[PDB]
Symmetry: none
């Protein structure tokens, strides 16, 4: 019974609705003898008579009544799918999956929550993790878009930069250098310093810049957590270098401050990426556009 055609079902259902081959033909802009043979073929496939002529009309047999609701269910299901596809296309349904490097937690979720108010039907997933996780997900095509800091050479990606990630010297509001301008980088000599964990991107960049300019800091502490570091600074433990976006909620009157040391900010970027040769969904390309938009004139 898979040998039946959709077209033969479409003829059958019309022929049952109306009571005649001819009325059906007129609806389906085909010929009455095409309808009759289509029905004979379909009855041969089913194995039973579908119709009985009584007076001027074709009435359904038991097997025909069953096939009618079978046809109605099937056509219902296709319509339903057609509705899905239409909602997808007009960004009123669908799924957006983002995997994002850790440092981007300070903007991405907020952007993403703005975007959903503007497209409520969308369902979202956000994964916030490290470079190794992200590489794995990329290898398995798990998300629509990936936001990273350093696009992995060994994976075919389509990407571009969209937002600068300055690393800046952060201090407590009462530090001597606070408010001072054009401060030479040698001024960091002998300063209590809170270092990020070994093997961190941030650590490595901070150390490289410090080796280049002969600066020797007193490492008071080593932590793995930017929040922890901000807190340690507040507590007087020292200064550090962190991504400026860690300062997003800080206002006019803050316990923290940026120092204005020369050779800073250490300049780094965030990229958007998708796998090379990927079919970008409607909402993905929509989101991509909205992203580049809101982060172009973003301080």
């Amino acid at each position: 019974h898979m040998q039946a055609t959709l077209h033969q079902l479409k003829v059958f259902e019309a022929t049952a609705r109306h009571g005649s081959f001819t009325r059906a033909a007129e609806e389906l802009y085909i010929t009455q003898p095409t309808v009759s043979s289509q029905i004979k073929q379909l009855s041969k496939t089913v194995g039973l008579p579908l119709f009985e002529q009584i007076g001027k009309r074709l009435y359904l047999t038991e097997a025909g009544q069953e096939l009618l609701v079978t046809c109605q269910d099937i056509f219902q299901r296709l319509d339903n799918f057609a509705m899905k596809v239409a909602d997808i296309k007009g960004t009123k349904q669908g799924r957006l999956r983002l995997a994002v490097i850790t440092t981007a937690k300070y903007f991405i979720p907020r952007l993403l929550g703005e975007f959903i108010q503007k497209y409520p039907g969308i369902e979202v997933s956000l994964k916030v993790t490290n470079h190794e996780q992200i590489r794995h997900r990329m290898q398995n095509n798990e998300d629509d878009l990936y936001i990273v800091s350093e696009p992995p050479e060994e994976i075919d990606l389509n990407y571009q930069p969209f937002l600068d990630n300055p690393l800046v010297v952060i201090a407590r509001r009462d530090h001597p250098l606070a408010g001072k301008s054009n401060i030479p980088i040698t001024a960091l000599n002998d300063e209590a310093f809170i270092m990020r964990e070994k093997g961190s991107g941030t650590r490595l960049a901070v150390q490289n810049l410090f080796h280049r300019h002969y600066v020797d800091v007193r490492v008071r502490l080593e932590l793995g957590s930017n929040e922890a570091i901000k807190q340690a600074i507040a507590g007087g433990m020292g200064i550090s270098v962190l991504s400026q976006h860690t300062l997003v909620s800080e206002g006019a009157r803050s316990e923290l401050t940026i120092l204005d040391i020369d050779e800073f900010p250490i300049k780094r970027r965030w990229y958007v990426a998708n796998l090379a040769g990927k079919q970008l969904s409607v909402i993905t390309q929509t989101f991509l556009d909205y992203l580049m938009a809101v982060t172009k004139n973003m301080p």
Copy 2:
């Protein structure tokens, strides 16, 4: 619209998704791979979204594809159902029983169901053996006349009752040092090489809870999702395990297995049969329900 799709196109798509391969699909359907290729391109144009993405040497379903695949499986199911009604008409069948049972009831239901049709050749049967999730799915859609579960879901308005006990027992190979001994305390399982079921499993839960309650530390040698695989692993002397005693129904004259007589075993579970939200039952459904209740009333577990 979407009535421009053909049933052949959906067959080709549904087999491609299933196999993850134009080649394997073409083999199944007795067609050339370019036929597969162009049928998919055509259908894909008709829908107006991509259904597949080929990233490297790997084929993936898009969102729209994932959604069409469910649509194809519903449609095909409905055509199977119609084919069955037709056979039932042709054979002047009195009507058809619809049963969905939890996985572990495959070791008593099918056989029992054979012996039930013996008594009424006027009746036909559609047995679905599946997990709890799929049973709850079928339950929301009124898909079946009776449901057999280990744990009736709290989401649904059911009319359930228990009918057969499901004792979980310790199983070893006939040559195990504790084999044929009596009244062994549960502490003797300390350090035994043990084969655990997979993580989400309620069998695993029941066992992990009971062992935690008795401060029993076993050496987990293996995790397996399959009862049959476990039984085979026990036969090869990998260790012992805890399984539903009914899994021994399929254990023949060549079997090396035995039940160790451990204190606080069996873990007592049972099976429930369930109607749905006070909806009345056919004469068939009730003739079967009475059958179930009779035959199982005093049915001994295997290896008694």
Copy 3:
């Protein structure tokens, strides 16, 4: 034997394993991709087993690689520890406080620890911030002077004591129709956008439970394992969530966040300071422990 190996070799290896890439490792170590490659194979012969395997464009660490990686990390830690004793000797310091604390305590311990240091300038400090499991290993290895945990482990013999409350609260944006309202029924939450923590977490469990133990069905809009990310999600209007009130300490003057006074909240949790049972506290430990207790005794939670 393995004394044939070189520390530079081990340093090249560990960077390769860490990066998943000879090129990215080569950039970090200020050297050449051929030299990384060279130095790894030189090391591989010495070991007697392959340390990596390349399938397609993917670089995988072998079983011997994975073992070597752990060995390299232990070794490098010991060298870093030696360098700290040296800087302590040469800095003519009074001594060093070692402290390991549960992840959620980063929102008070590091600040407090600064202030303590300002009070005792001869003391150096090591602050490890990590999860519960890892605090157990560290406990078993007598690694630290004091441990701060959300629940003391049963398998370890510990003197302990609670010192600060950990209220979990409902957090929302200040434009929310429930902002500024008193004595709100818990049932007001149901059918509301909600950001849920990751599966099998202290926090998610403790709110799924209290939502079924007071009959509340919520619309889960997102899943995140980062507290900061959730707060950012709330600022963007994504929904509400339940977080430790202490996560609000880093919420500056531009914050658009608030706590909703929902009935049957706060969910109440605690922090405990613990040491190994019977084991004498150093003068330094003791001085800190006293400072801790004083400062936290009447410490109000943020907002």
Copy 4:
């Protein structure tokens, strides 16, 4: 710090142990002035004196004393990794990961069980799953060996066949055709038959052979489960075709039997595969050799 070499620590540790440069240099088959200059360089990088001479002997400074303990730990940790590498090479420790296609559940776990008895140090994972799951594992390199019916072309694999998977017609012991021989395949026409699920491997291989010999069976039931089917057979609901390894536990006095039909068994195979280019661990190669051996002689059940 970390400009220090490992040989500098080794020379340092000998020097502390003997209390002289000379006795240390004799142990390391090097000269006395290499030792001195080595220690002096190390003393520079450390930033403090490591030794002081008291009387006839070099004694450790405070820094020296700490350096000695950190050296003994480093050397210790380094020897441990060598014990592991040695244990691995001689199969006394290590990991074997197998992922197998569903139907191999009736034999792989048993063999694996027998194998582990010989090598008790080894940890094992066995994953029993479908072709799609197996492909994902193959793509992410999650296991040592894969056991499959049909290796997927789009993945680079070294593979070889090792055991036949005959599909045979199965009935209840009282079936009319039981005991018979050279039964015509057309005997099955009109016969009550229990089919495997749509899209199965087995259902396809069965529907090929039936369309080819114009065979029309009375499909009484469809089921997803080999165990269920065997039970349904036993309950009188029909006959079916299943892999012969389903019958592994059945002895001479079984409620089941195999019907000796023309064009049967449908011959299918199992293969062992690993990814191409990948080099097999020592325990993996061991297992492979063992698998081929025990299967070479192996008869199907009954």
